[PDB]
Nucleic acid binder design. Structure first.
Ligand code: NA
Ligand code: NA
Length: 326
DNA sequence: CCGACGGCGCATCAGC
DNA sequence: GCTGATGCGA
DNA sequence: GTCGG
C-alpha cells in the first residue's frame, strides 16, 4: 500500500494497453513495473528512485513524477472519460470477450452488461456463460470452499476409477487463503506420452461431476482439457454458493509431475527453478526436464515419477508447496 | 538500433 | 467439406 | 514500455 496510487495507476494503464490499444507487450511492461514497485519496501519520492527498479524505464519514471506532483495522470484521466475506450476496456471483464470482441461490440453500440443482455444472438457460448456469471466469476473463493470443492472432485474421480490420480494445484496447493478458481490435474496409469489416449478418460470424469450436479456449465472440452463452471450444493434456507471456474487437465503419466510442479507455481518460483535448472545443465518446462548437451543440444526427457525427482536432477532439496512463493 | 517479450488447447473463423 | 489462422484464457 | 545483444 506504500505506493498504491502508483501501482493502481500502472495497472490501469496496463489494462488499456491490452484491451484498447491491443499492445500486449506494453500491457506486460506496465504489470512488471507495477509488480516490482509493489514489492518496494519504501514510499517512492521520485521517478528517478523508481527507475532504479528493474522494469521501470524513462516513461514510467516520467509518469510517476507527474502523479506525485499532481496526484494524477492527464492521459489516464482522459482515457477514463472516453466513452468508447472505457467501454471497450470494461467489456473485457466478461469471460469470452477479449479485446477484439469488445471493440466490435462497442463499434455497434453495445457498451454495457445490459446491452449484452439484450443481444444474446451476437454472443458465442463462452460469452453467454461469462455474462451469466459475470459477478460470480469476479468473486474470490475462500479456502474452506476450495476444500469442500476438492472433497467432491477427489471423491467422484476415485468413484469413476480408483486408479485415476488427481491433484488440485494453483495457489491453493501452496496453502493460499483464497483462490480465483480451481485447477485440477488428472492422470491415469493407462495414459502415457506414447500410448493410447482413450478419448474418454477426461470425459468420464467430467460426466460424473455433471451427474452429481457439481459441474454446471461447459466453456470448452476436448480430450485433454476441460474448462467449465461448478457450484457447491446449498443447504436448506442457505444462501446458495456462487458459481466457480474450474479447469480439469488430463496429462500423460510421464509428464504429470512436471505438470503439477508448473501449475503449482508460483510463477516467480518457476522462473528461479528454470534458471537454476539451466545453470545445472537441465531444461525444465511444463511437460518435461531434459539434459542440455555441451553444444546446447537437448537430450531426450528424463524419467520423472514425483516432484522430488525433478529436484534431485537439478541438485535441489525438495521444497513444500507452502514455501514455493519464490 | 531494433527484436524479444510464453505457449498451447479448444472454439470459431477465413480462405479454399 | 477440409485446412490453417485467429481469438481467447490460462 | 523496457530491456539488452
Ligand atoms: Na529500471
Ligand atoms: Na474477457
Amino acid at each position: 500500500t506504500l505506493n498504491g496510487g502508483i501501482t493502481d495507476m500502472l495497472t490501469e494503464l496496463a489494462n488499456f494497453e491490452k484491451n484498447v490499444s491491443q499492445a500486449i507487450h506494453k500491457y506486460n511492461a506496465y504489470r512488471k513495473a507495477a509488480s516490482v514497485i509493489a514489492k518496494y519496501p519504501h514510499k517512492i519520492k521520485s521517478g528517478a528512485e523508481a527507475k532504479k527498479l528493474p522494469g521501470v524505464g524513462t516513461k514510467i519514471a516520467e509518469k510517476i513524477d507527474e502523479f506525485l506532483a499532481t496526484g494524477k495522470l492527464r492521459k489516464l484521466e482522459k482515457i477514463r472519460q472516453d466513452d468508447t475506450s472505457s467501454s471497450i476496456n470494461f467489456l473485457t471483464r466478461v469471460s469470452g470477450i477479449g479485446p477484439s470482441a469488445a471493440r466490435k461490440f462497442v463499434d455497434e453500440g453495445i457498451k454495457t452488461l445490459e446491452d449484452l443482455r439484450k443481444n444474446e444472438d451476437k454472443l458465442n457460448h463462452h460469452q453467454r456463460i461469462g455474462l451469466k456469471y459475470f459477478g460470480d466469476f469476479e468473486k474470490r473463493i475462500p479456502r474452506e470452499e476450495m476444500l469442500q470443492m476438492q472433497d467432491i472432485v477427489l471423491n467422484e474421480v476415485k468413484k469413476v476409477d480408483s486408479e485415476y490420480i488427481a491433484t488440485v494445484c494453483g495457489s491453493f496447493r501452496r496453502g493460499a487463503e483464497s483462490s480465483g478458481d480451481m485447477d485440477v490435474l488428472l492422470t491415469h496409469p493407462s495414459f502415457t506420452s506414447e500410448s493410447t489416449k482413450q478419448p474418454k478418460l477426461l470425459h468420464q470424469v467430467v460426466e460424473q461431476l455433471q451427474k452429481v450436479h457439481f459441474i454446471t456449465d461447459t466453456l470448452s472440452k476436448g480430450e485433454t482439457k476441460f474448462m467449465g463452471v461448478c457450484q457447491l450444493p446449498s443447504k436448506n434456507d442457505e444462501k446458495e454458493y456462487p458459481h466457480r471456474r474450474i479447469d480439469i487437465r488430463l496429462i500423460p503419466k510421464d509428464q504429470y509431475y512436471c505438470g503439477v510442479l508448473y501449475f503449482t507455481g508460483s510463477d516467480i518460483f518457476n522462473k528461479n527453478m528454470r534458471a537454476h535448472a539451466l545453470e545445472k545443465g537441465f531444461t525444465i518446462n511444463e511437460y518435461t526436464i531434459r539434459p542440455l548437451g555441451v553444444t546446447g543440444v537437448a537430450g531426450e526427457p528424463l524419467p520423472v515419477d514425483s516432484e522430488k525427482d525433478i529436484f534431485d536432477y537439478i541438485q535441489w532439496k525438495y521444497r513444500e508447496p507452502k514455501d514455493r512463493s519464490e
